[PDB]
């Protein structure tokens, strides 16, 4: 085996490149804790 590239005239596939847009970003990162001391801003402590 020998590794080469993909071409639209030897196969029908190419490299797929698209543009990144800042305002359409979604994060995938969940907080480990919530609502407890040490993990929230002072504005968000509800004094339960």
């Amino acid at each position: 085996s020998v590794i080469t590239s993909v071409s639209p005239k030897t196969s029908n596939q190419d490299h797929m490149i698209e543009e990144f847009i800042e305002q359409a970003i979604v994060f995938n990162n969940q907080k480990l804790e919530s609502g407890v001391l040490g993990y929230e801003s002072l504005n968000d402590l509800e004094l339960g």
Binding site: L42, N43, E46, L47
Partner: protein, 100 residues
């Protein structure tokens, strides 16, 4: 100076979110032993600054030395020459008059 216990207790309730003004009022309304110069009872292992006031046996003492010092286990207000008090000067003077 601004608020009482019954006024401060009114900002912390079963359903009350926090804010910085509550802590500002909490800090201003209690006694700050560094900024108002009063430390209560003398303790060994504490550092003091010029002007501090401390209660040792039956007297209040103000520190005279201008540089920071450390409470030595041996150096106690009355033994050393850092501290000062009037209830001892006047005591000795009146004792002298009494003896004379």
């Amino acid at each position: 100076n601004l608020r009482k216990r019954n006024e401060l207790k009114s900002l912390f309730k079963n359903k009350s979110r926090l804010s910085e003004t509550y802590f500002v009022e909490l800090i201003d309304s209690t006694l700050n032993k560094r900024d108002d110069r009063f430390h209560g009872i003398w303790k060994p292992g504490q550092t003091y600054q010029k002007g501090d006031v401390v209660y040792y046996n039956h007297s209040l003492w103000e520190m005279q030395s201008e540089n920071e010092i450390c409470a030595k286990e041996e150096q106690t207000p009355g033994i050393s020459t850092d501290w000062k008090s009037l209830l001892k000067e006047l005591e000795q003077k009146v004792d002298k008059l009494q003896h004379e």
